[PDB]
């Protein structure tokens, strides 16, 4: 705040190497006039038409022996009705099988974006889930973030 | 819905063989005040500030031939000047041949997300299209979006 | 209707070699309410909350020698700290082997879209920095864009 | 009208990217007597037998990787027994190898016309669709059409 | 109350191996007002002007040698000259050259639409026949069949 | 004879190697009850819905050195729009890179079937043509023909 819009900006925390934890107070972010964070998800007050958006960048270390599959989704947790309801998702499986025999792993980089304004409710907790946590680039700021904005 | 704000969230019609038919009355279909779902393209209600966003999950179960070129374009054909002047565009390229005979299925997923703000006046057509709908993922509901929101 | 809000939306100059010369004074491209385009940097007039966005579609006819690497870094320069603070950071790597010996050069395509909302102060300047302005595609409308809007 | 029997002749919108669209107001495009196309489907508004016919012509220039299988599948999704029962269907094979290379690509003009008598009901939706939209001869009106006549 | 105008439209036996038995009923298969299927023929009720349509689809893996060249006819065996006159017939060759030993290959597809309007009498046997009954396709709804309609 | 119907069904003139003449007074020449035939044109009386149709079987023992490109167009001249206008056209590509070397020129067969109803009127002349008669096949049961019907 300034501007009266419950808005969030939750930059991924770079501490626990292998999971992903959303964090506030990481330089510049937002968790004001309504918007709060609890357990790996942002709880939406009142209700409304909120713009959702989460970024995740998959830092590579070569080409593991298989088609790993990458999956970036943003789930919704409703108050009345609950559990795992898919509001929006995406996928992109890394490297096409090279098995590093030659010039092994000069990194690979696959960033994914998700966005859309949706109809939410009071206490509606939205969360950005990942399939393979073991690949996120931590030489960031903007490489991994998650935010919601009031409209 | 809150206010008189022209919102419109549409997905792709699974039952529209080799054609990206934009559909409502789904999982989070928003039809606001003056939002008109015509022949795929969107009609602007009032005027001014409009946010246009769209994701396209170009999925593939193996990589075929040459240079892929899966594009995703958003153009506006207005009143006054009745012709389609582009807004947004994007082309992603999965296939870097690989096509080995002896493997064949190289499950590629190369999504194309877009988002920008435009002028859009009263009585416009918002054309959200792609060049190869055969490679359309209809697995998740957060598969494809078309969206408008006046500010 | 125009809203009482600062919003910028520039398209990279169709005619300008090797530079991201954001261009205004275009048809469906916007540059309004206080926010202008100064030093080839998007400068803001107010404060509070702002929606920052930009995508830079790349192309290189052929997959050359070693990791070319690509990065899209949206930074904020303030009238007080006067240092660059990276807000939207991301990396793209389009060829993990290719060297098309007997086929001249297969022209890969790779779009990088960075977008999030931030808390910015008065008089701050915005820049959609790019390391390799060698591979951008100008035969667009929206292949390379930049936009802001306070909310 | 002359005749008051339901006659609908809808020709393909030549500016619909990667999708076969049907419109009227063209050449000899008569969507008369109760027959209306709501969403790229022809809705028979009465009981009775009708002559259903439609043709599609495929462009293509330079035969690719084997079997694209152009499919012109004329169908009916009846409102009573809510299932999309194909009435017509057509699978065609474009080339016997070629894979241009040396004598680099020439067109392979292919006509696909279907027609037959079918007894229908009120509100019955008629489907045209083609799986290969990226191969249409949208230079000439009269070689891409849909039409039904009552008897 | 559909119509009281003699009409027939028999599809081929979905379970009859390498032949061409004609079945009324089946899918959206028609036969009404005198029109009847005898010894696999469209025998005429009463005299008049009738529309005659018979389309077939041929399926075959690899395009051999020889030059089998699939053909399809419609003959009018009646009462006077009840010896069969070539009502309507044509020829199409799927094979110029292949003999696919370099794999075993992939198939070929070839549809053949026959149609016209004739002056037939009471009790006329109209016979639609394919010289090579092996090459067909029951992987349809409406690929292979016969049909007539009164005036 | 029966039911006053603007009908016509005509075959070719086999007695002219280089031509395109439709001969009335053949096996089944249904040019009666009102229709006319003059300068290779089916003369349209009354006015009304006329389902037109024509098919041509092109034959050739191997292909000459180049892209021959066979066609087939159904055209009309109306008292109002006094000019040869395109109603129904179709193109077919028969040879690629066959132009023999090995063995003698192997026969390709290309049937061209088209049809579709339009609004025809009194004084309308309809022309049934092709590109080059040099590939027209004699054995015309239903090899080469043209016909009209009305409703």
From Swiss-Prot, chains A, B, C, D, E, F:
Residues 6-151 form the THD domain. Residues 1-151 are extracellular. It comes from the Eukaryota. Disulfide bonds join 63-95. It is found in: Secreted. Changing residue 26 to W: Biologically inactive. This is Tumor necrosis factor, soluble form. It comes from Homo sapiens. The gene is TNF.
């Amino acid at each position: 705040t300034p501007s009266d819009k419950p808005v969030a900006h939750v930059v991924a925390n770079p501490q626990a190497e292998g999971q992903l934890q959303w964090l506030n107070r990481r330089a510049n972010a937002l968790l004001a006039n309504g918007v709060e964070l609890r357990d790996n998800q942002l709880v939406v007050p009142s209700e409304g038409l909120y713009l959702i958006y989460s970024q995740v960048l998959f830092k590579g270390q070569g080409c593991p022996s298989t088609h790993v599959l990458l999956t970036h989704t943003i789930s919704r947790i409703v108050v009345s009705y609950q559990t795992k309801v898919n509001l929006l998702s995406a996928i992109k499986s890394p490297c096409q099988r090279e098995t590093p025999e030659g010039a092994e792993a000069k990194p690979w980089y696959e960033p994914i974006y998700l966005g859309g304004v949706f109809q939410l409710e009071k206490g509606d907790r939205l969360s950005a889930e990942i399939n393979r946590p073991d690949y996120l680039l931590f030489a960031e700021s903007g490489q991994v973030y998650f935010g919601i904005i009031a409209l």
